[PDB]
Short mmCIF file of C-alpha atoms and ligand atoms in Angstrom, two decimals:
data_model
loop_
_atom_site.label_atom_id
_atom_site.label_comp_id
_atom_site.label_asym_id
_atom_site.label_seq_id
_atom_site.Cartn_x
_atom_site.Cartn_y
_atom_site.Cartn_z
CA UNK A 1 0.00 0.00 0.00
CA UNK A 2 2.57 2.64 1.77
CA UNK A 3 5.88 0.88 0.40
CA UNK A 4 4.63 1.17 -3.17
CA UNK A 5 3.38 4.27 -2.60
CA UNK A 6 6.63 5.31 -2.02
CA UNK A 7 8.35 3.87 -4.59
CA UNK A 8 6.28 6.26 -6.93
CA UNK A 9 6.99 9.01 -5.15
CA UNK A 10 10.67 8.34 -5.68
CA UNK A 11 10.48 7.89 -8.91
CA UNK A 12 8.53 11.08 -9.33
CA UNK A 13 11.39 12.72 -7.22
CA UNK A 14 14.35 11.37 -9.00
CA UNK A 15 12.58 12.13 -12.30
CA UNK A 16 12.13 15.73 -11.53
CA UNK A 17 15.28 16.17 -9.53
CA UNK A 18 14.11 16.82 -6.02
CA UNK A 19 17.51 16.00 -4.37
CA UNK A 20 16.03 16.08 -0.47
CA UNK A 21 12.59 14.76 -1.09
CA UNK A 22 14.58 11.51 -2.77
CA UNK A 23 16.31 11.37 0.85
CA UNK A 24 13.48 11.21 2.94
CA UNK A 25 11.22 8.78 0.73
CA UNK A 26 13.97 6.59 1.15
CA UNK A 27 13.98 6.61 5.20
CA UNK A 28 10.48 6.52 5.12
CA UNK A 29 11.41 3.06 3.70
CA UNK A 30 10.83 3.73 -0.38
CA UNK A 31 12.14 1.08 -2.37
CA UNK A 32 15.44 2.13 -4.44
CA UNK A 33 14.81 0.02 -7.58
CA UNK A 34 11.36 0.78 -8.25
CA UNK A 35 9.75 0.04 -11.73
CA UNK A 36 7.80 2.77 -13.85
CA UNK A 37 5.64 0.85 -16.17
CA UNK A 38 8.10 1.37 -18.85
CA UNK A 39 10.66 -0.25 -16.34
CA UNK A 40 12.71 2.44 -15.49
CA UNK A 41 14.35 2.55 -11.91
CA UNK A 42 15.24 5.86 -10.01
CA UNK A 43 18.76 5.50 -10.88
CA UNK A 44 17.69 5.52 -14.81
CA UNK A 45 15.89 8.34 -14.18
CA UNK A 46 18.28 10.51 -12.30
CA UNK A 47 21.07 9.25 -15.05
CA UNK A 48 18.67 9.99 -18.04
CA UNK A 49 17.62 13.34 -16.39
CA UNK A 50 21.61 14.10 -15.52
CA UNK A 51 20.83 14.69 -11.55
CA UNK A 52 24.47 13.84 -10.55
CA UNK A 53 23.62 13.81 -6.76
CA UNK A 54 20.70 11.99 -6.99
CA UNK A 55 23.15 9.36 -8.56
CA UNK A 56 25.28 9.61 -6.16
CA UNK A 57 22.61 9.10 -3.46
CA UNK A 58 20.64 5.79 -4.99
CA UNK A 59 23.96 4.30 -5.27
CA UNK A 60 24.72 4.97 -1.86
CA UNK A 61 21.51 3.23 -0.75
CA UNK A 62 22.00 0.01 -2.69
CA UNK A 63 20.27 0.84 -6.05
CA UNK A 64 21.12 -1.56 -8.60
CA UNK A 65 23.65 0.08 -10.87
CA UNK A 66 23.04 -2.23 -13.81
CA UNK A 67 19.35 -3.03 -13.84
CA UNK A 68 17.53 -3.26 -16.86
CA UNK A 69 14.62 -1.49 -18.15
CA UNK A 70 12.08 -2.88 -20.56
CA UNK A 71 14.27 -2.01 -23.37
CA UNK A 72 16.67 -3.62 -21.64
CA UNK A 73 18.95 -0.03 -21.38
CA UNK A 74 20.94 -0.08 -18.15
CA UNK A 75 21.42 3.58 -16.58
CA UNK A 76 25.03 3.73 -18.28
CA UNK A 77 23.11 3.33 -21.42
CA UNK A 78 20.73 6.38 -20.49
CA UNK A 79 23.56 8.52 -18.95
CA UNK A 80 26.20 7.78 -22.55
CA UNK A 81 23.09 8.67 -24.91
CA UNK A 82 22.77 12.04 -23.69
CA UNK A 83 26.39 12.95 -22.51
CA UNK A 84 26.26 13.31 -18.99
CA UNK A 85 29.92 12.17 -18.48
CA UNK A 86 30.53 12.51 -14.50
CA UNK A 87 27.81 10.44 -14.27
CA UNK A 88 29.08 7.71 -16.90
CA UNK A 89 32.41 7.80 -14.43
CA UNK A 90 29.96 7.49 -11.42
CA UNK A 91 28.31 4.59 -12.68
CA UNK A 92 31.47 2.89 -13.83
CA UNK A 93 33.50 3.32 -10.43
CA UNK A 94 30.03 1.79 -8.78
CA UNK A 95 30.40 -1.32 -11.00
CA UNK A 96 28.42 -0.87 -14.33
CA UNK A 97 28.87 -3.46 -16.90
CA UNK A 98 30.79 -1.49 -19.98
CA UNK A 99 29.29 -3.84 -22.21
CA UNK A 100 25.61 -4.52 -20.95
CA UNK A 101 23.57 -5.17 -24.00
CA UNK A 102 20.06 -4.12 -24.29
CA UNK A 103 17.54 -5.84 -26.06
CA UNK A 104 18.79 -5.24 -29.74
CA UNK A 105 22.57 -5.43 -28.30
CA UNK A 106 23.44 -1.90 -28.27
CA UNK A 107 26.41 -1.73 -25.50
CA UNK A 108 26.56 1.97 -24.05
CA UNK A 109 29.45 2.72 -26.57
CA UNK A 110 26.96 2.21 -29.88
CA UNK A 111 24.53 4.77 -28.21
CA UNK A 112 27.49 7.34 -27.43
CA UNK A 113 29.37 6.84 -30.84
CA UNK A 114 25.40 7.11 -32.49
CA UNK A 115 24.78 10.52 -30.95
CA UNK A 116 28.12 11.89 -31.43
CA UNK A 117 29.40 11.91 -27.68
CA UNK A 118 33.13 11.38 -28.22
CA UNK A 119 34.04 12.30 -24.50
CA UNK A 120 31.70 9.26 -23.61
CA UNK A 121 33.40 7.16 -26.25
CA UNK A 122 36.51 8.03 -24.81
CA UNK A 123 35.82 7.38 -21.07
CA UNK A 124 34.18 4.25 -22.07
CA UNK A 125 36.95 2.59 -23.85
CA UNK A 126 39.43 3.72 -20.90
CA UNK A 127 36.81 1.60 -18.99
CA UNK A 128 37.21 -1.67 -21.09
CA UNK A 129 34.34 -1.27 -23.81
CA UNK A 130 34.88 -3.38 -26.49
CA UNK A 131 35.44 -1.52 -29.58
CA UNK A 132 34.12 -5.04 -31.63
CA UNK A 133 31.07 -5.50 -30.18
CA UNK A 134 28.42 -6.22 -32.21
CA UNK A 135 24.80 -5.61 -31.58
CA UNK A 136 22.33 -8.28 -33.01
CA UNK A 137 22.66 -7.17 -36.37
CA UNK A 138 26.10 -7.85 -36.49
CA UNK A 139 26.85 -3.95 -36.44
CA UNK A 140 29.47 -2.76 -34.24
CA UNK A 141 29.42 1.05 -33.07
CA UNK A 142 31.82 2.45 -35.26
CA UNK B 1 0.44 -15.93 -27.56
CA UNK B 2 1.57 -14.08 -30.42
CA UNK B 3 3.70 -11.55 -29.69
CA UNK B 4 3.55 -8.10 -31.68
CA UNK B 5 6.23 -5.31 -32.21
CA UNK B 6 4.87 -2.17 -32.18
CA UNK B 7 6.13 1.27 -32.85
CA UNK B 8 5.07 4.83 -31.94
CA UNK B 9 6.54 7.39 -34.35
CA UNK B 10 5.94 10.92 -34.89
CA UNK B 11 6.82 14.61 -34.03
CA UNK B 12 7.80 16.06 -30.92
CA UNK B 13 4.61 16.64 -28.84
CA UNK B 14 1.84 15.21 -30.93
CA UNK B 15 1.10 12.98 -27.76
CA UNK B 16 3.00 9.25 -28.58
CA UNK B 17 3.50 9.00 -24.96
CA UNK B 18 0.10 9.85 -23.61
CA UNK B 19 -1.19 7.51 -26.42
CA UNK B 20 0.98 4.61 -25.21
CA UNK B 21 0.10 5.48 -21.45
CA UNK B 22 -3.48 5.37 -22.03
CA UNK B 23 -3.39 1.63 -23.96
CA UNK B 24 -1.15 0.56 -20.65
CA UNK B 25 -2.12 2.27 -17.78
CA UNK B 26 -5.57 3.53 -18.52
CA UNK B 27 -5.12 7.14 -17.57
CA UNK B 28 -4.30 10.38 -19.40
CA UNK B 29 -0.55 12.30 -18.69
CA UNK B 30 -0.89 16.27 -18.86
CA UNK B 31 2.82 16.92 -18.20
CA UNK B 32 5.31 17.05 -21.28
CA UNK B 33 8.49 14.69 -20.26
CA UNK B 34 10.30 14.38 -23.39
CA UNK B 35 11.07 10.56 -24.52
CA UNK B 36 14.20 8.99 -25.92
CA UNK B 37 13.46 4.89 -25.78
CA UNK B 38 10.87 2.96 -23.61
CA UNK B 39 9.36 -0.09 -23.91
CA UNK B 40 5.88 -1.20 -22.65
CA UNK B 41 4.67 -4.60 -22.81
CA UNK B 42 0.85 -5.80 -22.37
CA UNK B 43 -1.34 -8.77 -22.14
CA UNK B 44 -4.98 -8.19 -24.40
CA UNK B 45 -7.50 -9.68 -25.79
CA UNK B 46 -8.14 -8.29 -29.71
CA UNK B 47 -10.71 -10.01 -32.12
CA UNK B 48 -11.37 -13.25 -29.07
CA UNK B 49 -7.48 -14.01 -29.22
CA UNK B 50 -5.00 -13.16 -26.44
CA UNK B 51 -1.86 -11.38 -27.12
CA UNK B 52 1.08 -9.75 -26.28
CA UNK B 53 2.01 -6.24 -27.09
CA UNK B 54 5.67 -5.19 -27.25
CA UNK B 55 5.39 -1.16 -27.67
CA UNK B 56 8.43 1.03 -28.32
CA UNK B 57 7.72 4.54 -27.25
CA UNK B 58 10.05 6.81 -29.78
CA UNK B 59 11.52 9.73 -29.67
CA UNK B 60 10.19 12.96 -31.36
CA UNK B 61 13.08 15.57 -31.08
CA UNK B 62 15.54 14.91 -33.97
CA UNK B 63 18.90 14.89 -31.89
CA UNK B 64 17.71 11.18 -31.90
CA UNK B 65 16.69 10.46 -35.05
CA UNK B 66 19.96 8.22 -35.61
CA UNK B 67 18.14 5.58 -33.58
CA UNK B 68 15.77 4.99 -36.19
CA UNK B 69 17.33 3.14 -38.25
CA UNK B 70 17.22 0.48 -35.09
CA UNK B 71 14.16 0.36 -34.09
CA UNK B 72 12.45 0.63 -37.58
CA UNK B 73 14.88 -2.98 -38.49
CA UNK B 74 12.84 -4.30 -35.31
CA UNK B 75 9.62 -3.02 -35.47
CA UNK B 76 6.44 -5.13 -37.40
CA UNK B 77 3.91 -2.51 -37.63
CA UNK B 78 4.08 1.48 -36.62
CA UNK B 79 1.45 3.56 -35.44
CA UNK B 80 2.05 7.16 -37.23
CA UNK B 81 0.92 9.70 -35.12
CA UNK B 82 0.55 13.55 -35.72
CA UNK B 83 -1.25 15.74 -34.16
CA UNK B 84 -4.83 17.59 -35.22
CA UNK B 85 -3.36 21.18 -34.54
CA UNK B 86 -0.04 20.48 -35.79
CA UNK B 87 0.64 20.75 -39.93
CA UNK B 88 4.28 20.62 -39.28
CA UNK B 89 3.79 16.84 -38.15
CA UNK B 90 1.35 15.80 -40.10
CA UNK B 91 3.66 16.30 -43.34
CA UNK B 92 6.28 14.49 -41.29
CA UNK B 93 4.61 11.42 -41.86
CA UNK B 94 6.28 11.45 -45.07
CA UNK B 95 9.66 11.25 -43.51
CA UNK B 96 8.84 8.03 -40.91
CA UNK B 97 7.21 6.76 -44.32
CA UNK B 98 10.11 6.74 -46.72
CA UNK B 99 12.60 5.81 -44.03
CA UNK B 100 10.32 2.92 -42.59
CA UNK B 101 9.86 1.23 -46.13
CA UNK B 102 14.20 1.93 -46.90
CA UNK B 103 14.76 0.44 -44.03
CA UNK B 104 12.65 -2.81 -44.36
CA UNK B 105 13.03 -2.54 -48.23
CA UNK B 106 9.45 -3.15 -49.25
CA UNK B 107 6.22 -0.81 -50.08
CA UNK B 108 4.26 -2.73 -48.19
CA UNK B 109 5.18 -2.64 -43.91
CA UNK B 110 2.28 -2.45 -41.10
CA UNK B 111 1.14 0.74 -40.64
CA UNK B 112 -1.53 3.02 -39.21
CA UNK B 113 -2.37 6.82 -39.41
CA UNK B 114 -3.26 7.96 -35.70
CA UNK B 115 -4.46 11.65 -36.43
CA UNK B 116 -4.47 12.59 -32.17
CA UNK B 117 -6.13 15.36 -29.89
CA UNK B 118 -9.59 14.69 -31.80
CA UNK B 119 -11.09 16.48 -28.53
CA UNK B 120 -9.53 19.48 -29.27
CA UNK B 121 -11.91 22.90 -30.31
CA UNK B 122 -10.15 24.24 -33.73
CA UNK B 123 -7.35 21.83 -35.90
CA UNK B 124 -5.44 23.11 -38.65
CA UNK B 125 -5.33 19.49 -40.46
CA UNK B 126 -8.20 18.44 -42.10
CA UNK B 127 -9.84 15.36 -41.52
CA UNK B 128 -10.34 14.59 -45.65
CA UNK B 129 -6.52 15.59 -45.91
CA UNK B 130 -5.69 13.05 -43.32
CA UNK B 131 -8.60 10.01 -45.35
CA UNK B 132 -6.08 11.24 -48.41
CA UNK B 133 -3.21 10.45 -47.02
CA UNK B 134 -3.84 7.16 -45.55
CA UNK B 135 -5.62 5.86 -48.79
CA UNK B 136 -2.40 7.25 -50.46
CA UNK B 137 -0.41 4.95 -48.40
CA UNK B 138 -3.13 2.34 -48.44
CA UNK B 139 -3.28 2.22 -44.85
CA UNK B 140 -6.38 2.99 -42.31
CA UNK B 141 -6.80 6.60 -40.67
CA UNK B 142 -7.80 6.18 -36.94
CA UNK B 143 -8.95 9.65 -35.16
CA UNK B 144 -7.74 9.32 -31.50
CA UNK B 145 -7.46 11.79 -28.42
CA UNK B 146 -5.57 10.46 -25.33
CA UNK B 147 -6.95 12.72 -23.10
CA UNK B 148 -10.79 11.05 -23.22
CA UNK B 149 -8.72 7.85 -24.38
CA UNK B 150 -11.28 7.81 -27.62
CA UNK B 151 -9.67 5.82 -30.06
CA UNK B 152 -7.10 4.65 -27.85
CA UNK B 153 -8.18 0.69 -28.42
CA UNK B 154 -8.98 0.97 -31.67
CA UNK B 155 -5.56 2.14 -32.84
CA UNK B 156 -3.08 -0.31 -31.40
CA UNK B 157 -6.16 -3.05 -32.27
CA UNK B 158 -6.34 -1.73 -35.60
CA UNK B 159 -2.50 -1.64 -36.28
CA UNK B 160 -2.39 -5.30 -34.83
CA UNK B 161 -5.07 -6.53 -37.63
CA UNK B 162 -2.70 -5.44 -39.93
CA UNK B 163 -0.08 -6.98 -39.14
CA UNK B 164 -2.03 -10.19 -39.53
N1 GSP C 201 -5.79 17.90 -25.63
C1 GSP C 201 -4.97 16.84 -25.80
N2 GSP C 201 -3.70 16.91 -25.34
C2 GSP C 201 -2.86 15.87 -25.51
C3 GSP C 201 -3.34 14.65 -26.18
N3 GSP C 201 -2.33 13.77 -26.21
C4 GSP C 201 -1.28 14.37 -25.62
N4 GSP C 201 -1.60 15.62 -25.20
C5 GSP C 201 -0.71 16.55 -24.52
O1 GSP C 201 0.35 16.99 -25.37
C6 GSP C 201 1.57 17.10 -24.62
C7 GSP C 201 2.67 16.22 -25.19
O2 GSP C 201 2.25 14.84 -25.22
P1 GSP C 201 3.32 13.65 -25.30
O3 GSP C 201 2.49 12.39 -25.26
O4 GSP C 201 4.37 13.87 -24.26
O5 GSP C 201 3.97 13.87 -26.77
P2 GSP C 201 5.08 12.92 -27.47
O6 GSP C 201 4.50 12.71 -28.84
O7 GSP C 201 5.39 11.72 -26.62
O8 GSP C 201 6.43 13.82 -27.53
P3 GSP C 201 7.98 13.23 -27.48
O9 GSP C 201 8.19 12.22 -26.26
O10 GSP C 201 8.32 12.48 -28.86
S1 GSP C 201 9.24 14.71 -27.25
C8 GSP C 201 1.23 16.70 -23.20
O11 GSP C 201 0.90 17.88 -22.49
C9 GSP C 201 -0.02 15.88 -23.34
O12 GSP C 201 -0.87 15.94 -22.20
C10 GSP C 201 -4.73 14.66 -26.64
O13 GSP C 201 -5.21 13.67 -27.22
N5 GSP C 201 -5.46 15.75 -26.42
MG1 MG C 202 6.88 10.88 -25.66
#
């Protein structure tokens, strides 16, 4: 009911950035990997949205650093497609998979190199990408 | 159950996302949040069978439009949307169009006009214009508004039929 509840409410928080209000749903007991319908987690959110603390924070209180959503795009994946790069380090010094395919095998690297982000590309290979990898088309990011 | 692919394509703000929320979640979004990439995944009933939907929720705002390519390889039908008040994307069905069929090399891919915000007091896009169009393409013209969730069903249902 409550715990659920929550879990909205932290979504809703994370989404829109409210740094504080992500701390207290949490203490009030808020689930840290809580699913949108679309399967997106706090931690995607915050990534997507570039909220660098709120990052910081969900990691801090065991959010899963390379869950999937129903794309199957981890948060690196959300965080390399729009350029955010402090958080692609965060994420990466918490334990992201480099190479976490999503449903169509895009790594985080074919989404970077897509949209242009060479700083991301950079970082990311520093980090162990695989500059071979091939999605399930056979196409590799180039 | 069969399992179907759909995807959501059109302009920025023509209301892709509130469409897709409404089939899923039965309830109507006000609030812009611009999309790059979700998935949504649903259980129905269409025409006594049960089925699966597989939705992709696309992006309108062209810094992604390099995606495309992707998701039109994967996609088996796509529900192109514009909006009622919006002439800019309704002539950007054209461009999902020709890269849809490029990309899947044939005239002939699943595919539904969803001409959205029906409830809306004054359009700019005709209604005839729209019939045109979509016997043009040889496709069917569904009018929809996500906000009183008319014509929500009937699009996805529709788009699903052809398919089949
Ligand atoms: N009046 C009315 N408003 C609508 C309708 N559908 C969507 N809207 C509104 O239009 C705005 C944008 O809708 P949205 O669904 O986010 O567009 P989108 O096509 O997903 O845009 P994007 O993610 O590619 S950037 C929102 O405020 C939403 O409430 C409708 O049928 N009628
Ligand atoms: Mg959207």
């Amino acid at each position: 009911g409550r715990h659920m509840d929550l879990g909205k409410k932290l979504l809703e928080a994370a989404r829109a950035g409210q740094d504080d209000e992500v701390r207290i749903l949490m203490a009030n007991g808020a689930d840290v990997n809580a699913n949108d319908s679309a399967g997106h987690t706090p931690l995607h959110l915050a990534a997507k949205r570039g909220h660098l603390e709120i990052v910081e924070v969900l990691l801090k209180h065991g959010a899963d650093v390379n869950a999937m959503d129903n794309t199957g795009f981890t948060p690196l994946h959300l965080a390399a497609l729009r350029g955010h790069l402090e958080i692609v380090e965060v994420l990466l010094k918490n334990g992201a998979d480099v190479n976490a395919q999503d449903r169509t095998g895009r790594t985080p690297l074919h989404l970077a190199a897509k949209l242009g982000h060479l700083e991301i590309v950079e970082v990311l290979l520093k980090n162990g990408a695989d500059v071979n990898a091939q999605d399930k088309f056979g196409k590799t990011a180039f | 159950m069969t399992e179907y692919k759909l995807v959501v394509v059109g302009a920025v703000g023509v209301g892709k996302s509130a469409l897709t929320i409404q089939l899923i979640q039965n309830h109507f979004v006000d609030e812009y949040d611009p999309t790059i990439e979700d998935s949504y995944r649903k259980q129905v009933v269409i025409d006594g069978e049960t089925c699966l939907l597989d939705i992709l929720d696309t992006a309108g705002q062209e810094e992604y439009s390099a995606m495309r390519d992707q998701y039109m390889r994967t996609g088996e039908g796509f529900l192109c949307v514009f909006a009622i008040n919006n002439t800019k994307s309704f002539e950007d069905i054209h461009h999902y169009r020709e890269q849809i069929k490029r990309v899947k090399d044939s005239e002939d891919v699943p595919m539904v006009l969803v001409g959205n915000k029906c409830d809306l007091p004054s359009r700019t896009v005709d209604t005839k214009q729209a019939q045109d169009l979509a016997r043009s393409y040889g496709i069917p013209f569904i009018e929809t508004s996500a906000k009183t969730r008319q014509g929500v069903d009937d699009a996805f249902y529709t788009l699903v039929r052809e398919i089949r």
